[PDB]
Specification:
The structure is cut from a larger assembly and holds 3 copies of chain A. By secondary structure, the first copy, chain A, is α/β, with parallel strands linked by helices. The first copy, chain A, has 2 domains: 217 residues, Beta-Lactamase (2-Layer Sandwich); 281 residues, Rossmann fold, CATH 3.40.50.300. In chain A, 32% of the residues lie in helices and 22% in strands. Chain A has a 9-stranded mixed beta sheet. A 9-stranded mixed beta sheet of chain A has the order 12-11-13-14-10-15-16-17-18, sandwiched between helices. In chain A, a hairpin with a 3-residue loop joins β7 and β8. The longest helix of chain A has 20 residues. Chain C: InterPro entries: P-loop_NTPase, T2SS/T4SS_dom, T4SS_GSP_E_ATPase. Chain C: Belongs to the GSP E family. Chain C: Keywords: Metal-binding.
């Protein structure tokens, strides 16, 4: 959208500079869509809070109706709104149609675009990858957002009744729905692939029409990342890499805000490049730089047929997934999952609990109700934690638990604790042998020392990626896919900074 | 009753359950709001601020049972709730009303506290064991015969003290017992509920005990003066509530 | 409504002076809505009680007849009797219409009789008719009309239960019920004679029609809805909840512990929930789902969702809102299915709060676990705090009191019993809240912060002190109270100083 534009423009020194009266300090400033929009994070001594200011090319009040007029005509051009047409061409017409200062031109096309190909009033928010949540609560209420670093902050964007009513129709339509007083609530997904709740009128939202947008901009933490944050040692990560390649199933358990999902997503970047993976989530959260992958998302059924995780897993397990990822087990679907496990499907998921005992309880008891005997098919269970002292915010893998199996006449769940985390020294201690490595020898048909060797090898590979500052998931997944393809060549390139 | 202690009148059949209830329901404070739910009208009350609700058979319309009526009566503000007789599910709502402070009263077909408990706990009533603690008093009525000697007597005044943790549970203190041999009511324990009153009222026991003896005299006098009718009786009772001082004097001066 | 009226009034002094014979003595008088209505607490000393007199502008057998005459014509106009229309313009559609009928029939009334007739037309058209005065008087909290020819009784904020002078006969009462019922969107009739609804303003209605299920005639009962939200200060002042417990709860909702406030229908549950919901941190994202708009908050970043009875239920809204990232979810009253969802929200880190209809905590668990709610036992662990409200009645006095504060520690490994801790229990005897123990939830907070339990405790006391300082300074209204609380959030020491420094 902006590359097609930003060339058709003439000037480059568009948009002035911000002017904030006293008590309004400027915390930070950065570009969004240079050189049109820029975002400024201002402070406010009085109310110890930061504020998000959305900067766009300033215009004249004469240019106002002026640009709102050139638009009043370009609107009656069906060949523009049509999404069926590639954006590259569509743009052209708007330009040519406009032919019928060398600076006002550019600082105008911006809007003309922002309203035909952009998101309008909120485009600054939709383009900025720092804003991961957009909350437009009601008529004449400043929009709030969730900043990648600042969190909840107020915004300089407000929409009066009509201004918002049309915004809600815009979003509703681009998502493919028809919000009206007859159907005042819409829970769809925008083209950019984002979750949009929306309400029209005031029947359900006295505070007027409204909308919310939870942007899928994530930038999922990486294994290398976990090493840096000291969340999981490189050695343990290699053990998991092998584990995952060999399809050992694992559940990430942890209290709330401990890292469950992060860690899962992290170690899911260890999946073999060609393997077919299917994921079932209540709401997208998992980002994977994997091609042969099917992402399935639950349906609320607000006004249609409700499709839950049970339905989706039941029918996904049905095709051929080498790997199955269930966002988090919160019920009935859990049974299907463990069934997938007893069947050899490399299954992974998350569970809200503090220790293996709680895990067991939750899994066995309704709503999950997973039969006692089925637990044997789970291979590894990681336990994640949150640890604090000063502003000392730490997410650590408290323990790597190896589920050996079931016991006849028992207590049942046989667990061998491989790694334990000592908070006193912030260290991961081996408190047992990684038995699963022996099961690998058996699978692979080699010796333990042999596997152990490959682990140490994979371990080195990771530490090197670390030293070389390869942090991004797209790049990390590439180098991992790499090693899978040819560990020999992969290792050499890594040692030769390439 | 003035203090809202809930009571159930239990008794074999033809013993006086309903009569007695209706009788002692004329003790309700003149201004208190009372709602009654019956399968069929039987309760007469010379009380104004009162809502009388009657069950609907549903012969050719929507059936509305006691459960529905109580559920939605307890919903408005009744100071006192009267359920003709608990014969099922609605019983739970009632004891809920009790745990909540609603002066609740009703009748139950049974011969002794044990039977009462059984019937209440078991289906159809199915009132949870632990809920019983909210019932205050349970009177047991009887029929007694010899020659043409037809007698309806309160066999016993039972005070339900509460529940016991690790128990047998239902703690009952029997205040009054009826000896048929001499046709006499014997006190066989202290009226503990009178102490709970002291606590409510914020006075001493002797003090409450005094008022009881006082109210007692008032009744015996109405008796001596032959004030028998319910309309007239309720008036003189409403009277005493309004001003026991003036009320007592008028009674002693035949007016 | 009345400010509009007071405009066109065209005069004042429409009320006379009552004639209460001996055995009757005025106790107190006060305008309900001058210069039209007035309440006169009269003491019928013979019967040693008081008796609320709703005083309205006087009219004669002839006058009222004339009034009734206009009503019949104006009645034809639909606009003025249409709810979707702005009261203000249909209030003129009325005056402008009376102008017609007047000048046409060639007649000019008295400046007074107008500022009297006008009162009645508005009343019976826009207002609540015969009971309007009761529906107006801020002191009346409840209205109870038992049946045909039975005086309406009300609960007066100062005199409690009291007999009223307003009495509706069958013809009048039946209409009254239908009107109230209809006005609530619901329908009533001999077919279906009982109705549990909520009036446009939020007041809860319980009506009955005919003598179908209710001999003695039709009846209704209104529990008025206070327009102004009680605040935690209001609650400390009213002896309903200790400032300490309130501080404890402040920290608790800040640290996103989910709580449910339990009680009997009309026990003050919503009032309390709304009050403590004023402890939500200022910038957070609040989402509220209700069947009836009741919660009032001075919180900008909040969306107030409301149920549609036709069709959109709490369930739908709840799971919907759960797809985003709301910081706080308020339900108002879980009555079914969604109860499960609400507890899941808890499981997935959402600060969740709601009201529940039950007496004990035992009853809470029972009501939660069984249909229609049907919350599995394993999920209860995710609830943090459970308060219990009660309405203590002793004489001509009502006391809404937080009867008990419970902490749900967890689920026992044996018999999976709910681990609970009652740290505060109310005492009806001395009307004193008692701390049977210290909050176990303070440790959970300590860890979540990395500080010593001792450190959290002192923070509590601090907030506690702040609250009592606000009380002592007469800071009671929600907007201003919320204002000062948000402050302590932004900066505690600066906030404290400014409190104890007069600013």
């Amino acid at each position: 959208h902006y590359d097609i534009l930003r060339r058709h423009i003439r000037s480059e020194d568009l948009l002035e500079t911000p002017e904030f009266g006293s008590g309004s300090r400027i915390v930070e400033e950065y570009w969004i869509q240079e050189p049109f929009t820029k975002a400024i994070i201002v402070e406010n001594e009085d109310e110890f809070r930061n504020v998000y200011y959305a900067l766009e090319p300033t215009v004249s009040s004469e240019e106002a109706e002026v640009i709102s007029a050139l638009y009043d005509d370009l609107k009656k051009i069906l060949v523009l709104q049509d999404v069926s047409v590639d954006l590259e061409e569509r743009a052209e017409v708007l330009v040519r149609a406009i032919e019928k200062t060398d600076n006002f031109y550019s600082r105008m096309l911006y809007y003309l675009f922002r309203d035909f190909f952009g998101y309008g009033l909120i485009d600054p928010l939709m383009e900025d990858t720092n804003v991961e949540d957009i909350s437009c609560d009601g008529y004449n209420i400043p929009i709030f957002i969730y900043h990648q670093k600042y969190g909840n902050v107020e915004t300089n964007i407000v929409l009066d009744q009509e201004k918002l009513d049309r915004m809600v129709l815009r979003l509703t339509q681009r998502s493919g729905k028809h919000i009206s007083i007859a159907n005042p609530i819409v829970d769809a997904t925008l083209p950019d692939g984002s979750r949009l709740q929306a309400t029209f009128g005031t029947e359900v939202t006295p505070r007027g029409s409204s909308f919310t947008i939870r942007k899928f901009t994530i930038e999922p933490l990486t294994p290398i990342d976990l090493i840096e944050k000291g969340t999981v040692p490189s050695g343990v990560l290699a053990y998991l890499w092998l584990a995952i390649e060999h399809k050992f199933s694992a559940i990430v358990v942890g209290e709330t805000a401990s890292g469950k999902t992060t860690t899962l997503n992290a170690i899911m970047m260890f999946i073999p490049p060609d393997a077919k993976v299917v994921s079932i989530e209540d709401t997208r959260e998992i980002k994977l730089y994997h091609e042969n992958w099917i992402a399935e998302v639950t349906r609320t059924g607000m006004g249609e047929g409700e499709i839950d995780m049970y339905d989706l897993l039941r029918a996904a397990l049905r095709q051929r997934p080498d790997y199955i990822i269930v966002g988090e087990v919160r019920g009935r679907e859990a049974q299907t999952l463990f069934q997938a496990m007893s069947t050899g499907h490399a299954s992974y998921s998350t569970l809200h609990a503090g220790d293996i005992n709680q895990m067991v309880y939750r899994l066995e008891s309704e709503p999950l109700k997973v039969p006692r005997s089925m637990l044997q098919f789970l291979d590894i269970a990681l336990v994640q934690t949150m640890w604090v002292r000063g502003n000392t915010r730490l997410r650590r893998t408290k323990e790597v638990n190896e589920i050996l199996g079931i016991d006849p006449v028992d207590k049942n769940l046989l667990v061998n604790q491989f790694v334990k985390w000592d908070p006193k020294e912030d260290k991961h201690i081996e408190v047992s042998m990684p038995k699963k490595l022996e099961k690998m020898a058996d699978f692979l048909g080699v010796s333990v020392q042999e596997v152990y060797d490959e682990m140490l090898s994979r371990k080195r590979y990771l530490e090197l990626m670390l030293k070389r500052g390869i942090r991004n998931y797209k790049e990390v997944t590439r180098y991992i896919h790499a090693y899978y393809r040819n560990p020999e060549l992969a290792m050499t390139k890594m040692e030769e900074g390439l | 009753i003035e203090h809202k202690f809930s009571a159930i009148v239990v008794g074999e059949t033809a013993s006086g359950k309903t009569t007695t209830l209706n009788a002692i329901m004329m003790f309700i404070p003149p201004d208190a709001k009372v709602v009654s739910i019956e399968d069929t009208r039987e309760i007469k009350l010379y009380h104004e601020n009162w809502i009388a609700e009657v069950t609907r058979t549903g012969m050719g319309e929507g059936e509305i049972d006691m459960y529905d009526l109580l559920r939605a009566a307890l919903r408005q503000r009744p100071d006192y709730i009267i359920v003709g007789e608990v014969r099922g599910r609605e019983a739970q709502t009632l004891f809920q009303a009790m745990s909540t402070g609603h002066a609740s009263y009703s009748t139950l077909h049974a011969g002794d506290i044990n039977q009462m408990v059984y019937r209440l706990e078991s289906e159809p009533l199915k009132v949870p064991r632990s809920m019983l603690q909210f019932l205050d008093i349970a009177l047991v009525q009887t029929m007694w015969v010899r020659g043409n000697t037809r007698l309806r007597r309160t066999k016993e005044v039972n005070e339900i003290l509460g529940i016991d943790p690790v128990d047998k549970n239902l703690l009952v203190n029997q205040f009054v017992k009826w000896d048929p041999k001499e046709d006499k009511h014997i006190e066989v324990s202290m009226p503990k509920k009178l102490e709970k009153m002291a606590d409510f009222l914020g006075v001493s026991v002797q003090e409450v005990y005094d008022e009881m003896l006082s109210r007692k005299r008032y009744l015996e006098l109405m008796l001596k003066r032959g004030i028998r009718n319910y309309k007239e009786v309720t008036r003189y009772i409403h009277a005493y509530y309004r001003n026991p001082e003036l009320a007592m004097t008028k009674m002693e001066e035949g007016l």
